[model samples]
Target: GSSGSSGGCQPSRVQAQGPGLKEAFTNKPNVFTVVTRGAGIGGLGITVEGPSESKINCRDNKDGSCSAEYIPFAPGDYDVNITYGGAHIPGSPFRVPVKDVVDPS
Candidate 1:
């Protein structure tokens, strides 16, 4: 898992992809987040990267759970890069299996 300058888990730049996301075309549509199995390494923070202006961030809760906030945009493929610190994560850059990419909205 990567940490931000403050030493907190840093967010990886994500890009959504696939035919499941091409169902809408709203500029300010609501986005969502999900907590997958992270990477081969343990511990990490996830951020859903999408339309530049509509990038959404997800955070883990005190109870050990996480959620993706809502944002807006049409569906498409996004290269969701997972990183930690100021560089790419060790053995990261894992893809959120097409079956795991969740749309909470």
Candidate 2:
């Protein structure tokens, strides 16, 4: 709402995959996948911050798409921010859930 720019292009949409409405795993290295779709998709920037520390290792698909992996040692919430053209995307700073295990229900 108050972030990300179009830059003569369509706005971007960011979301976390797999986890959906549930919390992610914290025992192992979990890839917090983020999908972005927009026009003139370039100059992409992703930041992952959570329980322990923060890291930026988003693998750019080189086709206006990218995703990053994060390993959480401590169980807590994480914020994944995505920026395009030096502006925060529509859904930037997503609240991620991290837990010790998955609830089989």
Candidate 3:
């Protein structure tokens, strides 16, 4: 329970429309790494593979319309949860695996 923030990242429910990057995303077989800089290893970590719903969505909330660029942590819509721990000391700013909705498409 010490990964993201003290409050951490709460599970968010977001909706999407058509005309998406689905075409580009049509093909599967992708892989990615979830790493942090100053977390100091510790017992805190994240398992970013299999049966988990982990996605990186980009958005342009300004225009209202949106599309999520899905990073398949696991297939299907999942109730995603991220965790981490602090070593009594603090971690750096860019030390977190910060995933943001950049292009609310």
Candidate 4:
């Protein structure tokens, strides 16, 4: 991960882009946008922090765009944090759960 922050990596400007920013079971590589267009940013500062976030992966998506794919291989309301420049996104520290386990009857 070649993280860079040459310029324009403003905290106010960047956004927690996309819906997946908000989960799971299929292990389908849940991707969510963290940086914004023209941010020219590259850094783990844009990251997903959580328990099962070890296997999480993220990368650049052209200019003004950086995204990440995380994995929550468990079932529970896990507190997942998404940030940019060390700043929390709109609803930072969001919660996600993997609710696709065995049948419950």
Candidate 5:
């Protein structure tokens, strides 16, 4: 008999959210949401490839969603990488274009 088991894991329940997912503004809250509903909680990763890597932070929320944000000091494109189950999710590296505060209106 083949030994195989799967439980307590969900990737379909995961998704991206917030204005930052579409675009971003400099010095603003460039954030995206990740809902951890009945999913592999620790298997989620939201990384940003940008100027300040340390400034990037993913805050866990009690509202069934996590806030993933990164500080954009300069107007440029940012790579938002999301992974689950040790594999890259659909649109793994989301290219988010950043604009100046006055722009993207």
Candidate 6:
């Protein structure tokens, strides 16, 4: 499977091992979390890019997991990059969805 900075690819090996990606809530401190079954904390890296040039902060849990908190200034798509062994994982660039707020009246 081929992977790119913006595109889908074969299921990632880490993703295969465990839950690849997880998102909490739009209003949570850690909106996104990735858990790798076998890989530990030291060798994994993650970077997130929000739509419309938003800010994103990601952290490694040092226990086969990492998370990022994003402030949704606007609604659009977000991109997540995960790399291991200095190479893009099988499904490197994962597209995240951010929908606009509704009145819900």
- Scored by TM-score, the top model is 5
lDDT of each: 0.39, 0.60, 0.30, 0.56, 0.72, 0.53
Worst 10 residues of 2 by lDDT: 14-23
State every prediction's TM-score relative to the real structure: 0.33, 0.62, 0.23, 0.62, 0.73, 0.52
lDDT of 2 at 14: 51
Q: Write the per-residue lDDT of candidate 3 for residues 1-105, one digit (tens) a residue.
A: 556543442111222222221211212322222233333333332222334444544333354332234444323322222344432222111111222324347
> Per-residue lDDT tens digits of candidate 1, residues 1-105?
355433344233323333223332334333333233332323444444544433556556665334444343545434344444344544233332222234677
**Candidate 5 residue pairs in clash (backbone atoms < 3 Å):** none
Better of 2 and 4 by lDDT: 2
Any idea how many clashes model 5 has? 0
True-structure RMSD for candidate 1:
9.6
Compared with the true structure, what per-residue lDDT tens digits does model 5 show for residues 14-86?
A: 7777776888878888777776665564557778776545257878787777788787777777888887766
Task: Give per-residue CA lDDT, model 4, range 39-62, as digits (tens).
Answer: 335344544444455366667676
- Candidates sorted by lDDT, best first: 5, 2, 4, 6, 1, 3
* Predicted structure 5, TM vs. truth: 0.73
The list of candidate 6 runs beyond 4 A from truth reads 1-12, 16-30, 40-42, 60-64, 102-105
List candidate 2 segments past 4 Å from native. Answer: 1-9, 13-16, 20-22, 32-37, 54-56, 62-64, 101-105
Clashes of each: 15, 2, 14, 5, 0, 0
Please name the candidate that would achieve the greatest lDDT relative to the true structure.
5
Residue 5 Cα positional deviation in candidate 4, in Å, after optimal superposition:
11
Tens-digit lDDT track of model 2 for 6-100:
33644455555645224555655556555666445557666667767743455657774556765666668877666665667676577877776
Better of 1 and 5 by TM-score: 5
Q: In model 4, what are the clashing residue pairs, if there are any?
A: 3-42, 4-42, 36-64, 37-64, 38-64
> How far off is model 4, as Cα RMSD?
5.0
